[PDB]
Write a protein that binds this ligand. Sequence first.
Ligand SMILES: Nc1nc2c(ncn2[C@@H]2O[C@H](COP(=O)(O)OP(=O)(O)O)[C@@H](O)[C@H]2O)c(=O)[nH]1
Lengths: 152, 246
Amino acid sequence: SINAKLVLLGDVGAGKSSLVLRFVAAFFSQTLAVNDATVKFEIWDTAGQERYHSLAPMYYRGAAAAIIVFDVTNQASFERAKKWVQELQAQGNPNMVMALAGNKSDLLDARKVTAEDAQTYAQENGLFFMETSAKTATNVKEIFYEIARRLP
Amino acid sequence: MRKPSAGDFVKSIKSFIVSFSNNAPDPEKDCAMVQEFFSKMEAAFRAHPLWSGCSEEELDSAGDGLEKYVMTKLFTRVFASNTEEVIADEKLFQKMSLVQQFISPENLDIQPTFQNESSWLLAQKELQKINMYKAPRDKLVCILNCCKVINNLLLNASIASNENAPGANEFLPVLIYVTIKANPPQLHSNLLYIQRYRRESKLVGEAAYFFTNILSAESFISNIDAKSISLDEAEFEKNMESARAR
Ligand SMILES: Nc1nc2c(ncn2[C@@H]2O[C@H](COP(=O)(O)OP(=O)(O)O)[C@@H](O)[C@H]2O)c(=O)[nH]1
C-alpha cells in the first residue's frame, strides 16, 4: 500500500550491513504490515567513508525515512551520526522519519556511548533512539516496524 | 510494425521524428517532448482494439522497441549535442586517463579483504560496451551488468575472507575504481542521455539505485584531487605529471 524510500547512513564498521541483513546488500525491497496497512520499504545503503560524504545527498534525496546507525562502542561513530542528523534536518524533507540506531548493544565491556546521551540527543532533535543488536537480533525487526508505524 | 495492420502507428512515429527537428534543439524541452510521446504511444499500444490482446511482457517489449527506434533516429540531435556536454565529457576522460595510471584500491578505502586479482576486469569491459549501443535501455544495461558483475565478485571475496556480504561501503569505491580503469568515452553524456531518455516509468527500483551509484561515481571522479584519494599534494602532482609524460 504505502511505498517508502529508506536510506541507511553511518560510518564504516557501525553495523549498517549486519542490521539490514539480519532484518531481511546495498539495496532491498521489503514489505511489512502495520494496522490494516502495508508498507513496502525500498532500502538504500550508502557509503559511510568520509571521502564519500559529499555524495550522500544523491542517496538521501526524496527519502521518507532514514536509519542513522552508530556503534555504541565507538564515540566517533556517534559524532558522525549526529552530523548526519543535522544534515538531514538542514537538507532533507521535514516529513522524513528518522531513527537513531545504537548498534552492538550486546557488547558490555566495550560500550562508550551512553543511552542517555543518545536518547537525549534524539529527544531534542525530533527523532527516536533505539538500541539494536544484529548479532542477537534485539530490536532489528522493531526499528523498521517503528519507522513504518510513524510514516505520515 | 512492418504489418499493413499497424501502418498508422508508423505514420505517427515518423511524423514525430520529422516534427522534432522543427524545434531549435534544447535538452530539457527535447526530453520532455520525447517522454510525453513515449507516454502517449504506450497508452496507444495498450488501448488499441488490435492489441487487446497482448501480454504485459509483450507491451513492455513494444515500449522498449519504440524507445530504441525513436532514439536511434534522434541520436545525433540529442546525444552530447552541445558545448557544455562536450567540454564535460572531455574533462572527465582527461581526468581518468591520468588517474587510472596510478590509482590503487587503498586510495578509495577498498580493503585488502575485498581485493579481486583481475581488478574486476569483466565489470570494466561491461561498462565499456556503453558506446556500442544507441538505445537508453541498452546503455543502462551495460551499467547494470557492470554493477552485477562487481557485486558477484565482491560476494566471492567475502565468501573467501569469511566476512559480511558487501554493502555500499564495499560496492561504491569498487565502482569508482572500475569506472576510472574503464574510462568509457563520453561518460558524462551517456549518463545524462540515459537520465533524460530512458522510458521514465522504467528508471525505478534497483535500476535507479545502481544508476545513482554511477552518477555519484561520475561526481566523485570529476572532483578528484590529492585529498579525495588520500595522497599528499606533492605526491599527487608528481603522479599527474608522470601520467601526462606517458
Ligand atoms: N557484537 C556485535 N557485532 C556486530 C553487530 N553488528 C555488526 N557487528 C560486527 O561488526 C563488524 C562490522 O559490521 P558491519 O555490519 O560489516 O559494518 P558496516 O561496515 O557498517 O556495514 C562485523 O564483524 C560484524 O559481524 C552487533 O550487533 N554486535
